[PDB]
Structure 1
Amino acid sequence: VTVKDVNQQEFVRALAAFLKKSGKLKVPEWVDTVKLAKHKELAPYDENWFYTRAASTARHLYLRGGAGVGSMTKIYGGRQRNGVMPSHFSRGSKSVARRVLQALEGLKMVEKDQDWGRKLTPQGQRDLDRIAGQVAAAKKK
């Protein structure tokens, strides 16, 4: 495994947990309260979820040259039920993603990229690749 080698769900699942063990990520004190998207029906069932998003994002950046919060809000953004009106896109929160981006920096997984947008760092690039291997290794099944 390149991270590209591992399936997205298991990769994210494994990394997100690894982050949880590490114990040092950092977390707008909120996260209990927050929905994550105006579109959103209820907050996240796994109140633990902050880690999962972080993993998801780290993987998301590693794939691509550089990305920023607006893109993430939309990615997270689902369809919002206008009620009487037909449903439409609504890019998902900007505080969570930003905080995610800021926090990741602390670990050095990602760093400000040139010309705007955060890019993965070689430190992160190394870190993701390492867990990617661990996941591949676990088993067949």
Structure 2
Amino acid sequence: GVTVKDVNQQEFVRALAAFLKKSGKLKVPEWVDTVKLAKHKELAPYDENWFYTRAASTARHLYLRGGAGVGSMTKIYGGRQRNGVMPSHFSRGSKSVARRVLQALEGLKMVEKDQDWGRKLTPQGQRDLDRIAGQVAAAKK
């Protein structure tokens, strides 16, 4: 068999986003079209279905490193805070959009809440991760 670490993570997130588009029950609001991701970013994201990419990334990050809250999600969503003529710094991501991603993934039956915070991944979802890893392996082979 294969594993998601042997699977390259560039096409794995796109295949999992295609799987979540095949599912299509992950609570997409209407303010996603008008929202900006964070204050260090300038404009809106280009692709319209950019909730499912964040959901796929949150799924693989909770699969690899479980037990994470708001700060571990805002750490990966960061960049250069270009204020202007002032020298730039680092800024954290938004909290509410990651909280809505966690609420959508908790409403979907693939995770389970853990003590002292965090959403671990259930053995039912581990089978699904292994099957989609086999699907990406069969697609690349």
Indicate the RMSD between aligned Cα atoms, in angstroms. Answer: 1.5
Q: Give the number of aligned pairs.
A: 140
**Deviation of the 1:53 alpha carbon:** 0.7
**Deviation of the 1:80 alpha carbon:** 0.9
SS in structure 1 opposite 2:5?
helix
Aligned 1:1-141 pairs, distance under 5 A: 1-138=2-139, 140=140
Aligned-pair identity (%)? 100
Residues 44-63 of structure 1: CA distance to partner in whole angstroms, max 9, x if unpaired? 10011110110011001100
Q: 1: distance between equivalents of 2:111 and 2:92? A: 22
TM-score after normalising by structure 2 = 0.91
SS in structure 2 opposite 1:93?
coil
Residues 26-58 of structure 1: CA distance to partner in whole angstroms, max 9, x if unpaired? 123311111111111111100111101100110
Residues 74, 89 of structure 1: 8 Å contact kept: no
**Deviation of the 1:9 alpha carbon:** 1.1
Structure 2: gaps of 5 or more residues: none
Q: 2: distance between equivalents of 1:65 and 1:17? A: 23
Structure 1: gaps of 5 or more residues: none
SS in structure 1 opposite 2:12?
helix
TM-score after normalising by structure 1 = 0.91
